[PDB]
Structure formats: C-alpha cells, structure tokens
Design a binder for these strands. Sequence first.
RNA 1: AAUUUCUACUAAGUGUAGAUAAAGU
Lengths: 1070, 106, 106
Amino acid sequence: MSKLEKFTNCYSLSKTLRFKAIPVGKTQENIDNKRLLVEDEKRAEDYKGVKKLLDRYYLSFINDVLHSIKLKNLNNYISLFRNKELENLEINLRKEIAKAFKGNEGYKSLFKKDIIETILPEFLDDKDEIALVNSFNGFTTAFTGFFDNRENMFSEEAKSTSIAFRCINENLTRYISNMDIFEKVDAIFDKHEVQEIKEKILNSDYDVEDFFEGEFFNFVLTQEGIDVYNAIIGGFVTEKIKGLNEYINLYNQKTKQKLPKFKPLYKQGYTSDEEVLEVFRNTLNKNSEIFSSIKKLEKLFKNFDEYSSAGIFVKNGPAISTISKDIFGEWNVIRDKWNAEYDDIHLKKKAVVTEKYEDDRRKSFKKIGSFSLEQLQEYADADLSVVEKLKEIIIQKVDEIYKVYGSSEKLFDADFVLEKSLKKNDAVVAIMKDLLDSVKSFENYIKAFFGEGKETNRDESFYGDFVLAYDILLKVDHIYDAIRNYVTQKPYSKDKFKLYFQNPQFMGGWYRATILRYGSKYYLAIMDKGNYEKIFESASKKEVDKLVEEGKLYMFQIYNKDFSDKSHGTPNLHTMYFKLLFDENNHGQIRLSGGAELFMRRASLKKEELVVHPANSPIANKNPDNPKKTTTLSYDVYKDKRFSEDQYELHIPIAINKCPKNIFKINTEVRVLLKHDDNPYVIGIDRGERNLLYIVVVDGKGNIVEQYSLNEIINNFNGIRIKTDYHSLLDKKEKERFEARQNWTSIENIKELKAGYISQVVHKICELVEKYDAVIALEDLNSGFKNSRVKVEKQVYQKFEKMLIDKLNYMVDKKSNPCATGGALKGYQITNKFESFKSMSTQNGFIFYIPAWLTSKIDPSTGFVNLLKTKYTSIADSKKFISSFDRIMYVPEEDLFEFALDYKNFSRTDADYIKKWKLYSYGNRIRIDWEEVCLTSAYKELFNKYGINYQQGDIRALLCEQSDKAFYSSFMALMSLMLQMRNSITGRTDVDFLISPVKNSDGIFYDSRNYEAQENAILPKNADANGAYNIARKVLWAIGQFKKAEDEKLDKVKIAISNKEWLEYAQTSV
Amino acid sequence: IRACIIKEIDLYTEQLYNIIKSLPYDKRPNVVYSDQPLDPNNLDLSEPELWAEQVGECMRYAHNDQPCFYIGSTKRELRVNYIVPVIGVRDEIERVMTLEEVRNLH
Amino acid sequence: IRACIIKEIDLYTEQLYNIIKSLPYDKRPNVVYSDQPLDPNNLDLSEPELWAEQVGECMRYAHNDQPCFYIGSTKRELRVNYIVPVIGVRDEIERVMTLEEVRNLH
RNA sequence: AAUUUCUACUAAGUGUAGAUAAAGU
Ligand SMILES: [Mg+2]
Ligand SMILES: [Mg+2]
C-alpha cells in the first residue's frame, strides 16, 4: 500500500540515446572510395550560404509586403498618445501588420519546399548560387528548424525579436517624440537656409516637413524609408550634407540654450586570435565609435545640472537599490522613505501593520514605473544634492575607465605582436577583460536613467543626447559575449554534420536502415543504392559480411564503453534503455519511435598535440579521500583520446510510455495520498553556508528521521565505497580563481563542476525518495534571498530544480530488476514535465515549493524568532525600546539577565503567536573581524563601567536615565548580538552553531553544540539543518491542511504558508 | 652557448618532471611557467609576465616524449612546457626554490 | 663542444636511471659501463674494453645526488657511473638499444 | 586521466560512480 506504486505509466516521454558508430570490416574504405563524406561536408558548409540567400529573399519579401500596407489606426495612436484605451489599439495595429504579412498571395511558399524548389532558384538568377540553391533539392527537411524560427518575425506576439514589435513599440514612439521635437524646434529655418538643400539633395520631390506629419508614418515601414528619414535627420553624403541634429548643435553653439535634438529610428563566432585582437583594436580604440560615445556621455553627465531635474528619471528595480547604496548610505533608504510616505497616507493611527498590508505595499512599490530626480531629491537631506552625487560618481566611473585606458596603451599600437596563443596568454586577456568589465559596468549603471520610456514630461533636451550616445555603447554587450565565448573555449570541438548517403528519405524509419544484432553486439546496417538477428527473421553472417566486402552494405557497430568486453561495473542509464529496446520484458514501454540520425565529427586535435600518461609509471591520484595514493597501469592513458579521431555519432530517439493507461492528474493524486496517509515522510533540502546542500528527513510528526550533509557524494561499487568531498574541490577552484590573472575560464569550470555536483545530488535525492516514499521540500526561488555566503547560487540551484523535475518525470533504479516496479521498464512518474522557471512554485507532483522566510534564524524547539529591530538610531528610539520591555532584571540564581518582553508593545510583530517571551543572556555569541563574547559578562562589564546597579530588579527605569551617547549604542549593539542565533566565524572555521535565548517548557535553552556531537539526533545540528527542518515542517503543515479538508476541496487548498500561520505552527507544534 | 643553455634548461625540467610526478597534488609548489626555456641560474623577477601558480598533472607528449605540465587544474587547459618553482602567490615573488626544497615537500 | 657533450651524456644517464629504477631485476638490460661519459650517438664497438653485463641496483650518491649503477650483483661492488644498453653477452656486441626499447622490457 | 556527452575520478587495470532529449535558433 505504498504511495509510489501508483505513479507508474502515467504519461508519455521522449529521449534521444546518443551513441558512436564504428565502421565494421572494410566499410570505411568502401566509404572513402565513394566519397560519401565530402558531399555532406560541402552541404554543411553551403548551409550557411543558402541561409544567407534565404535571408536576402526574406528581406525582399518583407520590403515588398511593407510597400503595399497603409494603416487606419495610426492617426488615432498619435492623437491619443501625446492606460488601457491605448494598448488595445496598439495590439490592433500589430494585428493589422501581421495580417498584411500573412495575407499576401505568396506567404504560403515561404516555409515549405516551394521556396527552395522554385522561388529562390528564380529570384536570384546567378549561375553561381543557383548551384547552391539546387544542391539542397530534396533536403528541405534540413531547414525545418530554420523555417520554424524564421517565421516568428512575421508574427505579432510582441516578443523582443519580431518585426511588428520593432516597427510599432520602438519606432512609433520615436516618431511621435520626433513630431513633438519638430513642433518645438522650428522657425530657426528658411528655404534660403539649409532647409531647401536638405529637401533637394535627399528627397527632391516633396517637403521635409512631410516626414513630421502624422499619417506619413506609413512611409518609414520600409528599410529605405528608415534610411531616408535617418538621412534627413543626421546627414547623408550624396558634398557632406549636414543633418538636423547638428543644425541644432549649431544653434545651441551660436547662443547658449540646451534645445532638444531628434531621435533616429531603429533598423529591422570568431576563429583566430588575430581576428579577435583586430576586432578589439577596431571597436574599442581611443578614436572608435564606443570611446566617442563614452566621451559624449562624460560631457553630458558633467553638464548634468543645466537640465531640469524634474525631467530626468531613474527606472525602478535593482537600479534603485544601487542608487540608494551609492547615494543614501546603503541598500534600503529610498525604499523605506517611500514606505514612510505610503504609511502616512494608507495607514491609520493604529499599529495594525499586517503581512497583507506589507505585501500590498510591496506590490504597489514594485509596480511603480520609475522615479524622477526631483522625487529622489525630496527624499534627501539638508545640503545633499542628489544630482551632484550622481554626477561625481559617474565622473569617477569615467575617470576609472580613462585610467584603465592609460594602463592599456600597448594593446592598441600597431607594433604589438602576440607571443602566445590567446587562450594560454592571460596578461592580454586580463587587459581586455578589465577594459570590457569597466565599460560594461558603466553601461549597466547608466542604463538606469532610461526610466521606463513610457511617461509624459521627459526632458528631451537630455534624453536626445543620452540615447544618441547609449545606442552606440550597447554594442559592448555583443563584443563582450563574443570575446568571452572565444576565450572560454575548449581546445577540441564538437562540430559535426549529418550524413544522408545520397538519400533524402534516409533513416527516417524502421529508408535503407536496420538494427542487426549478433551475440552481444548490435549493428546498424545501411543498404546503398554464425547467424545475425534482424530487428526477428535471421540471416547468415557469411553473406552479410560478403555484402560488406562488396559495397552493398555499410555495417556500423553501435558502441559505448558499456558494450566493451572489459567493462564490469554498472552500465549507463541510456545503455540500459538501448539494450531494453530489443528485450523480451519490453512490451511497449520503451519503443523505437521516429528515425535515427547518423552524424560525423572530424578529428579536432592534431596528433602532434596529443598528450599521454606514459605506461608503467606511477600516476598520482587526485582524490585526497582515496586510500590508494598512486596508480601504475600497464598501458597508456591519452588525454581526450575521443577528440583525436573521427567518430560517427548516432542519435536514436526513444518514446517512453507511448500508450499510457494510468492517466490522471498527478497533483491531486499526490494530495489524496498525503491526506489518507497516517505517517508521510518529507525530505527537506536547504542551501547552507558551510554545506552545499543539507538533507533532513522528517516523518509525519516533526521527528527528525535523518539529517546529514551532502558535502560528500558516495559512490558504491563492487562492495567497496569511496567518498568525494565536492566542497573541498569547490574551495580549491575558488582559490585558483583568486590566484589567476583572469577568471573567465575559472567561472565556467566552477559552473560545470557545480552542474556535475547537482547531477550527483539528483541521484542522491532520488534514492532518498524511493527509500522512505517521502515527499521533497524545496525553497521557492521566486521570492526570497540568500545572503551572498551561500555557495550554491540561484542560477545553479534553478538548474538543480530543473534537473530534479526532468529526472522525476521517469525515476529509474539502475541496480533494480528492469521489469520490477521502479526499474527502467516501470519507472515512477511522480512529477509533471518542466515548463518554466516561473511556474516552479507551490507544487510539482511530488515536489512542493516553499518560501524560505523564517527558516534558519528560528529556534526549532520553541519556535522563537527575533522579530525586533535592535539597531541603534538615536537616544529617543533606544530609550523607547528599553522602556517597552515588561521587565528587565538580574536573576541571581542562574546568574543571568532576564528580558521579559511582550511582542504587543513592539512594531511589526504581528506574525507571532505566543506573544510573551522571556529570554535570558545564556551562552556566548560570536559578533562581527570576529570576536567571541560571553553575554552575561559583557552585560555586567557594561553596567559596572557606566555606574549601574542590577541586583535591585526591574532596572528599566534605572537604565533610561543615562545621558551618554555611546552607552545606548553599546547597549543596543550587544542587545542585537544577543538575539543573534546563527553564529559563525568568518574565516572558514567550521563552527556554525545555533543557540537560542529562550528556554522551552522543560527549562533548557536549545544549543546545537549539544546535538552536533551525536548520531541519531532529534533536533537540528546547525543553522542549515534548522533551515531544512523548517522547510520540511512547512510541508508538514500543508499535509495537515490537506488532512483538514475533504476529498473534493483538496485541489483548492492553498499551501503558501503565511508568516502568521508559520509562526503559529512552529510555536504550538511543540 | 645557446645549445648548452637549452640542454641545461631541458635537463632541469626533466628532473623537475620526474620529481613532481610523485608528490600528492596538495603539496605541489607554486611555479613560474612559460614556453621558452627557463633558466633558474639567471632568472630575475620584476618582469611583468611572471605569475606564480600551482602545478597540476604531469604527462608526456605523445609524439616526442617531451614532458609538459598543466598549471592549475587540468580542466583549465593551461598546459605549459617549462616551469620553475618559486615562493610566491602573485606578482610579489620572493625567491626561487631548488631541486631539493621541492623534494622536502613529501 | 665538450660542455654540451657532457650535459647530453648526463641527461641521458639520468633518464636511464629514472627508467631502469622501476624495472624488475630479472628484466634489466645488458649494458656497457665506464666512468667517463658515454655517448651513444658516437659509441663504436670493437674497442677491447667494452664488456656487456647486466645492471643491478640503482642508488644515488649521498654528496651530490649523482646517479650510480651497480653492474651485476650489488655484492660484486662493481659500481659505475655511466652505462649504455646493448644487445650483447660478451665481446660480441650486436647493437645499442634506445630509451624506448628499455621501457618495452616491462 | 580513457567517456555518445558532462562532472568527479583511476575505482583493481583498455576502465569506475552518477546524470544525459537530440536537431535547429
Ligand atoms: Mg558504469
Ligand atoms: Mg574530466
């Protein structure tokens, strides 16, 4: 009556097993004597040519259909633009455009065989490239993806990469702003002046003002229209003709007034160290487009005060936190000023601050588009000008850019020659990375001042110049990505090309392809234009080998290191899948659906570069936790031997559970089974600071069944058992990164090491799940933060959750019998298919996503949590704090200090349930540069040092009489570190205990150091065990909620546990 | 003089390979690496190209059996041909160890 | 020319030491031994002083860490400083093996 | 440090443990 046994054969799934084909007999010279590997390499090299030709034809078709188009909704847009009556109209406009595209009499051919067969061999009419467009005759399928991606531009889904979005959302806005700027900047002009020469030289037929009319936007839809408009804007040689922006500059230089300039419309990997370095020299030299953009932005931001502060803006997001950090002290000052001004309006005279109120305030804030500079000036203080600080910090960033340029004079001079390769040279890559990092930091910083765009009173005098400079600067992103992907590049390469064998319909079924097998060897026989086993009519090995010798057959051998004869351990998972394709216990579970694909990878490493471990010489072992410290092999060990030869890869698709029968909803069945179960286990996972991942398995009543670190992955084999400490490997990699000149390669190495680690943790968690029939408990990554000491960051943790979803779609035990429940043929399907990183929330089959609020700084034996705000601000606030306690006295029996508080008298303490806590000065706390402090002795020291008796009792009144400014500072300091539960020495010393200042019903304070020296412990051993324990107890609360509801209202039960309910549960469960 | 200098540079790096091949990876020294022969008898610091990092694996070239050393991790693919042990962490190099101070490591 | 010749002779004998140190004693080659440096690139037979015997132990001099080889048994106390592997049993020497034909032995 | 491919290896000697949905953009 187990839970998992019902979640097999649920839904369908698909995978591709990749193998390596080995030519058998004289197949390779029979292939080389027909040159069946040069037609296909030529086709793989002509793919890009035909791609460019199809792009050119697409551009011709686009400029054709964009000629026969005139909108009827554009005048309404311009009339209503200069919050919901406009978006319907703009989506109507995009739908009109998309219908004009999809309404032509030729759009049908654009993504089918006709565009290669008839159209493109006619639109071109060049005997050189008609050869190209005729080579791909019958191979239309080779473009299936290209077409399926080259049609998302002719659509209207408004994603960042589409023609409609470009023409409307990014162009019409600039056109309307240009109409405004032309209406404003006029009457400085004459036909005798440069106006008539503009018209004559660039248009020659109609007036120039016609390009600032409203319904003439249905002229800049075509790329040539954009070109002529940007010509009359900026200036277009035929005689260098000046444009409107520099006529404005000429006016603003004649007399001094910052008059706005127009905005131009939009326009709808490297392979050698010398190419990379010359691209660097070209795009980033001291007279390039980018350095000139930097100089222009410098002159602007140093001329930053002659622009009206009410017109500038700053976008709302991470930019606001960074701006507050750089201006208003630290992270959250702007946010708290906005919260103060929001309470002064939407909060009564009462202290009723509720989590729903705080959440609606947070939502209202996060929905604010952007903040002006006058607003951010009101939030400031006396004699602090926000524009001066922004100007000075931007000038500091610019001067740092200039300093790095002055430190990098050498990479620009023509005499420079490369001594070493770029991937092995790290001085020049350090220079390039430092420059790119500084420039991209500046680019990402000044990205804030583009404050949401959609707003009324933008100071166009500033934003003209700003966007003029910034639209050239943001090319550093592509340059950075290209250079980085070039440097972090393996010395080998996995570039391959599919082989067709003069047959468009090749291998697409089970065609001229079959999978033979002989003994324990499986063969792929490809007909051209002993006893085996066909896949079951037999053959004769003699005549099939005769065919192989003749040439009528192309027998490859399917092979991976598990088909070898010297392999004795456990086979790979996909090897087991493949071997099961042809098994008897396999009825229809894993079947051969679709057609295979035979690729071909050429040798990338020259045999002069091959490096080897010489035979009969002791090799050092890299695993510190290995007993055997050396190894002596009787043969050679080549490094990357697989990439030093040609290899025929083979991709075979498989469809698991093609004809399912146990079809139902997985989530509701999980809820029903968790309800009807009397003791459901739960595996809580939490990201620690000293541990990569930490597991705590908790039964259906809150009792810890297991708790251990996932620091070391344990591989079992042959009965032996060897451990690997991935935390030490990660520390070694981080130390190496600290030593290296540049850390482009180190970061990729760390990412791939973490990916491998989570690939091991996936199996760990699966074998934990199929041992207790437990239910997993993961942090909800959408809402929350981890304070920068957690090793596993959010990206790799998101990849870990994705890997767990993709594994739990079909969970297999390799060691188990295949036909047995849990084996490869009957694997558990206890999770739905992955959809997106945003839908990973609140449930996924056997996976519950849980917010990580109040999980690590909470006493796991009493539920206590420090909800106070013990930060020193002034004498009055600390006096009110001290006067808010119900009693503060010295208990002489225990030699402690009791602080009898009451959470009712304190602000923002509504989540709590047992409002009357009594917390002492028990134990020692580690403050932060770290220093250990015994609390009671520190209190006695402070009291005696400032002349204060404490044996009296209720010394609250005796304590709020101190006139000294530093007394209350020290007092609130050690009162803040008294409520510090998670203590840890910074300098990596593994002391991460977790003490609590309150005592439980039995009268003993929880101290983790009493449980770390134990196995089979009932309470968490440290803060991370506490996090996992609480993340499990939240799912236990959700299970209890399921038990409260009926068997039809289960689907609606909300399980997003709120702070009130969570603290209530944690404080009454005991 | 150039022929004898290269011979000395190679005999020294062959001895260094034979020595360093047996130390456990956590004991390997910090070295200064390059592709042109390195001469410890004349090697002078303060050159803006010397960076002290730690040796990794020690393998042999398959075509002419020349020893090569992987600086840092093998997965970093920073394979060099000539190294020299130093007492240093960064551009602040103190001194050059000898063929016996590397044997004392283990 | 004499300095480079001695350097080559010593690098070759150091490699020979590092190789022969690991073979089991029953596989050791037959060699031609002497106390002056031996140059395999020019070594010509028919000299009435070359006797092919089998290497024994391989130890290091305590004062300058120079490799020395015991020809025959260690108990024979025929310790030499420079050897060269040959295919021979007596004054009838056939040819001179190379630094890889000695590695193929085990 | 060998791999269909990835990570950590050498894991008892031409491999070990786990994972792996490919193509195209
Ligand atoms: Mg295996
Ligand atoms: Mg590896």
